[PDB]
Amino acid sequence: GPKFPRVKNWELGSITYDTLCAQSQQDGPCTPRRCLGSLVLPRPPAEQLLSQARDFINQYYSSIKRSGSQAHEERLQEVEAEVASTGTYHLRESELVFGAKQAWRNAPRCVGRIQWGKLQVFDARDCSSAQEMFTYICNHIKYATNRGNLRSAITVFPQRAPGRGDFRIWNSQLVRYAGYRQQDGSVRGDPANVEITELCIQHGWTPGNGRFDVLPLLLQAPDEAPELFVLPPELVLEVPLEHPTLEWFAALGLRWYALPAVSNMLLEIGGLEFSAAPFSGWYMSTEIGTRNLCDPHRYNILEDVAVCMDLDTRTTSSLWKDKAAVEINLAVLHSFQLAKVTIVDHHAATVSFMKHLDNEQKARGGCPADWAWIVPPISGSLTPVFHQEMVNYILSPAFRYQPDPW
Amino acid sequence: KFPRVKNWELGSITYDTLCAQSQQDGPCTPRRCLGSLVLPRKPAEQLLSQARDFINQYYSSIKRSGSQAHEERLQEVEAEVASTGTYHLRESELVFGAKQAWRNAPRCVGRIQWGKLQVFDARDCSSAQEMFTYICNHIKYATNRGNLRSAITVFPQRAPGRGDFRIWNSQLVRYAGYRQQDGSVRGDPANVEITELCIQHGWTPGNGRFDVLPLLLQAPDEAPELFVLPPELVLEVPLEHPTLEWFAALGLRWYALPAVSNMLLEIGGLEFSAAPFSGWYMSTEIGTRNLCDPHRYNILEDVAVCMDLDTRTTSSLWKDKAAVEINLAVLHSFQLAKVTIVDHHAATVSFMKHLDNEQKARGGCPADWAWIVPPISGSLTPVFHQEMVNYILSPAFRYQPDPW
Ligand code: HEM
Ligand code: HEM
Ligand SMILES: CNCc1cccc(OCc2ccc3ccc(N)nc3c2)c1
Ligand SMILES: CNCc1cccc(OCc2ccc3ccc(N)nc3c2)c1
Ligand SMILES: C[C@H](O)[C@H](O)[C@H]1CNc2nc(N)[nH]c(=O)c2N1
Ligand SMILES: C[C@H](O)[C@H](O)[C@H]1CNc2nc(N)[nH]c(=O)c2N1
Ligand SMILES: [Zn+2]
Incomplete structure (x- = not known):
């Protein structure tokens, strides 16, 4: 009508x-x-x-x-x-x-x-320098993290x-793991972060070599070269991942950070x-569990977890990917709850x-x-939003993508 | 551009x-x-x-x-x-x-x-009776004793200025949905309406969860006619699980042939x-959508209780765990019965x-x-990460209104 x-x-x-x-x-x-x-x-x-x-x-x-x-x-x-x-x-x-x-x-x-x-x-x-931006950011992280009760x-x-240069934070998030390109072609850490890691190195950062090295911040005040700032470790809250019934999962040494803080929009x-x-804000569990840890172009741990669960990885029809993925997501939820760090599963979300x-x-x-x-990246039709038609359109005020400052 | x-x-x-x-x-x-x-x-x-x-x-x-x-x-x-x-x-x-x-x-x-x-x-079809003969032959060819074609x-x-030839059913094989007056539905809720139309056109209804429907066939400007499919033409696969021995006890089953008839x-x-x-089924259509959709057979909670999962809270991912076992049962059972099926990963x-x-x-x-993108495990499939362009080319399949 x-x-x-x-x-x-x-x-x-x-x-x-x-x-x-x-x-x-x-x-x-x-x-x-x-x-x-x-x-x-x-x-x-x-x-x-x-x-x-x-x-x-x-x-x-x-x-x-x-x-x-x-x-x-x-x-x-x-x-x-x-x-x-x-x-x-x-x-x-x-x-x-x-x-x-x-x-x-x-x-x-x-x-x-x-x-x-x-x-x-x-x-x-009122911020007028890169040093001052670092202060404001640290305060934000502290307030937002609130010892695990995220705000x-x-x-x-x-x-x-x-007629003046932009304030820019070069990192895509305030907390991100380094991605180190290896001499064989592979990547140690997060491959999503290769470019930003190499930019930090060019700008004087002494690089680590772990799968989970927190990147320094690259901060740019108007008409000036970006400056490098190391976050004091105690501000960056992380959660070690364990599984409630699979006792070996803790031995994988996986972990993620508490605060999803987007900074390039x-x-x-x-x-x-x-x-x-x-x-x-705070994470939805599938962001960490399914995307960051299981995307083929990210940490890509699916086959590794599946092997430990002793699944049949030679055939699609064993549903080993689906099985491993559920357990990884469960580990994320369980660990965050155990650590008393705010998180939400994809059903409650x-x-x-x-x-x-x-x-x-x-x-x-x-x-x-x-x-x-x-719609979440696993269990799609098991959540109510899957069956809900939606209308997509741009309203303002708005968050928007913008070109990388380099 | x-x-x-x-x-x-x-x-x-x-x-x-x-x-x-x-x-x-x-x-x-x-x-x-x-x-x-x-x-x-429109x-x-x-x-x-x-x-x-x-x-x-x-x-x-x-x-x-x-x-x-x-x-x-x-x-x-x-x-x-x-x-x-x-x-x-x-x-x-x-x-x-x-x-x-x-x-x-x-x-x-x-x-x-x-x-x-x-x-x-x-x-060269001129009557409902003829459509029935053609339909029976189609099903026979397509089913091919489990080797689907x-x-x-x-x-x-x-x-x-002439009415249309129509098959009133949405698919050639469908399970009845009987509405009990105490709200609930026995069988497939997606089919309550078609089930009722069949009954008033003279079908004697069953009262099971998997009663195969008769076909309502309409030749132009004639009332539709009722035809019961010969039970031997309708291949069904009983569902069991490779490791959960109790799964067969649920009495679940599904038909081999996905045959859409209203487009x-x-x-x-x-x-x-x-x-x-x-064609043939992809396992998620049966396991996830038909059996687990809240507005279909909706069996998630049942399977979850049998697996002794914590149904109290969402954060135990009981829904996800039961869903996976159900899809696994579908694959196993179709494979055991030598009936064609493809999983969502292969697909x-x-x-x-x-x-x-x-x-x-x-x-x-x-x-x-x-x-x-499949209804479970979206991002664990390559299509999730692939951008796609949607548009209409002709020749084409289209939706059309229900003939009643
Ligand atoms: C409080 C808890 C929050 C949750 C659980 C949440 C959840 C999510 C999720 C799951 C996504 C999808 C992103 C992806 O898959 O990479 C998303 C996107 C987004 N969120 Fe939220 N969010 C929260 C808070 C916020 C806040 C505080 C803001 C801004 C003030 C925000 C703004 C956005 C924007 C702009 C996107 C789209 C990003 C893009 O287009 O790339 N969210 N959110
Ligand atoms: C041979 C194996 C086939 C497989 C595995 C397959 C798979 C699928 C799947 C999973 C869907 C989504 C349907 C749903 O979620 O309800 C779909 C939709 C569809 N399929 Fe195929 N299909 C096959 C053969 C065919 C054939 C033979 C035709 C027609 C000649 C066809 C035409 C269509 C059309 C028109 C749709 C969209 C239906 C709608 O919009 O409601 N498919 N198919
Ligand atoms: C890869 N897609 C683009 C891209 C690149 C980097 C980060 C990102 O995340 C978007 C985003 C934005 C805000 C969020 C707020 C809360 C939350 N849990 N996730 C959130 C995720 C999205
Ligand atoms: C838009 N209404 C959704 C709706 C209603 C009734 C049947 C149906 O099935 C779609 C459909 C069509 C063709 C298919 C071919 C093969 C297959 N495995 N599934 C197939 C599924 C889809
Ligand atoms: C609202 C939403 O578009 C609707 O539920 C769609 C989503 N994707 C789907 N995908 C398939 N294969 N089948 C479906 O019925 C649907 N339903
Ligand atoms: C091609 C496709 O658009 C792309 O993979 C999208 C799909 N849906 C997504 N959904 C969320 N929440 N985050 C994503 O990055 C994506 N990626
Ligand atoms: Zn569009």
Whole structure:
């Protein structure tokens, strides 16, 4: 009936319509001729800045129920004046907080959005050096880790400025394991991290040689070479992996870090671009257990675990990969619980997401979601989100990919 | 322009140029992607263009493009359409058309097999009784005592101002779903509606969990007729587990032949409303979807209790552990019964080889990532890490409304 996408849940038979998608002011990669929804990474003039700024200020005043008021029209005139004399403008602190949270809420690929209202926003817009960035980051890590009782947080560094260089954190995460290319062609540690490891070495880092060496931070303040900073070990909480019934699993010496803190994304609010704005939550167990440890192009431990479980690895039909993978995931969950470090399994996460979808249906008339990323990498059809159709679209404020600084 | 397509495990890049041959719209627009939706929301010059395109594909396929036979066949089609508003395919064109529709099916992980398809021409069918004979022969051929062979039977095309030939069942073999008035369903909940239609058309119902349904067959503008399949034609595999001796005690079983019968086959603008086709099962369809889906037989909790797993909490991954044992039971049992089946690992591996064949052959291959990636162990298969482009090519299989 209504002129909006109809959206079905096939488990429950329930129907909704997404009206929120009509607020998208930015095109995705799909056309009526072909769907490109499965691609990971598909491919200012003051007039364009102003329309984005106005849109965000409207968003802000709506959220505090003062839409159309005197303070709304004054903030609008102030932003236009600011832009008129300087080419850019600045956010009030409470505007920054609302934007950072709206950006997380708007992120289609995040299954953890039930939590979006509980985000601690650290304003670091006064930072003027790389040393100072290191201080802010350390504080963030400390606050976010909270000795294993993890708290969502984001630290926002100064925005892109006309005729000045960007604040950048070169590492893709605040905590990452080194990946050392060996003379045979293979990689010790995390192959995902080969490039960043070699950049750290060029910049003067004395390299380790373990499978789990924590990388130093490479931090770049405006118009300056990046500087190297070693994280003090006591700040970086790690969890050794053991299995509840398989006693040998502990002998593998596997481990992972507690804090998933992404640091290379661009946070865009009202046309303003924050090139350095690391944020962190807590892991879903399949991220560590299935992706980081079992991806063929990552740690690739599946065959090793399977051999220890004495499975038949000469034939697909023994389901040795599925069997090993479940035990690895169980080890991740059990170890994190034993260490009292916050973690969530893929069943509890997806159930909480279904609740999130129901909330946003009422609050906003929809919720942008990327099915391929929301559905977990193991046990897909055993979670409720698998049977839930989703509509994917770009809303702003937004977290965005950005080119590597080198 | 043309999509850049990357495999994230191997770092290799292709470009899809096949998609430029798509002439029919999908559901997506640049404002929003609707790729996860299961079903679509909803003259003579048009028929002539689709007809001309298909004939061109056919003569190109046999390397005789431009031949005298080619030019004449285009005039034949043009003469039939100008005179009658429609036209008919020759058997060879139909055989080609059916294979191309399979080859073009973006949701099918089994397309490495696309050239090996037996095509039965049932276009000289005039009654429901005749459709039944054709269907029984199809099942007999396809089943082949456990050595499954892909096949399709094609019934008369749709015609203006006449009802359609239809098989009302979604698959030729399906288990009944009886709704007990205390809410629950005995049997397959996916089939409650078809089960009820059968009963009021005069079927005496059973009361088991695996009662094979009769077929409702409809000749144009006639009420459908009921036909019970000869029990010897329906091959079933009882499920047991290689190590859990209690598993056989569950009484689980499934049929060998996945034979879809409600899709529409479109070739060169002609529409075949009844064109059932079958191949063989991939184990996850039975183990994960049919037996473990919450809105199907939903046996996860039962198997979990038998394995003495901690059902109290999600963090024990009881669901994942039971699911794996069920899929293992399916593989073991089909293999023990000498019935064709492929596991999701072998299947996705063969699909990758297919993407590669098709890249060289046609410059791309339409694929629906959400459907190609198996319902358990997604990222442990190569297809997970492969980007895919989805679009509609003709000839094609399409959904069509339920005839009731
Ligand atoms: C609090 C617990 C959280 C959980 C369990 C969670 C879970 C996830 C997961 C599993 C993914 C998929 C990423 C992958 O597979 O590599 C993801 C993506 C994402 N998350 Fe969340 N998240 C959480 C908190 C946050 C926070 C605090 C933010 C930002 C303020 C955030 C923003 C994002 C963004 C932008 C993506 C997409 C990244 C990309 O496109 O590459 N998440 N999240
Ligand atoms: C020979 C072995 C075959 C295998 C292993 C196979 C595998 C599969 C699987 C796993 C699906 C997903 C279906 C679901 O989840 O319900 C599928 C879908 C599909 N298959 Fe195949 N298939 C085979 C043969 C065939 C043949 C012979 C045809 C037609 C000539 C065909 C046409 C299709 C079509 C049109 C779909 C999409 C159905 C829909 O959208 O509902 N397949 N296939
Ligand atoms: C390989 N895909 C791109 C890529 C590269 C590096 C990290 C990353 O992770 C995304 C991401 C972002 C935020 C997250 C928040 C919480 C969490 N558990 N995982 C999260 C994962 C994604
Ligand atoms: C969109 N409705 C989903 C739906 C409803 C009814 C049957 C069905 O089966 C799809 C299907 C089609 C062809 C197949 C060929 C081989 C095979 N193993 N499974 C196959 C599965 C799928
Ligand atoms: C090709 C495909 O898009 C790619 O492998 C995606 C699929 N789904 C994903 N889902 C999550 N959560 N994270 C990922 O990196 C990916 N990768
Ligand atoms: C909502 C979602 O698109 C829907 O559940 C799809 C997902 N992928 C699937 N994949 C296959 N093979 N079969 C299916 O029925 C589905 N269902
Ligand atoms: Zn799309």
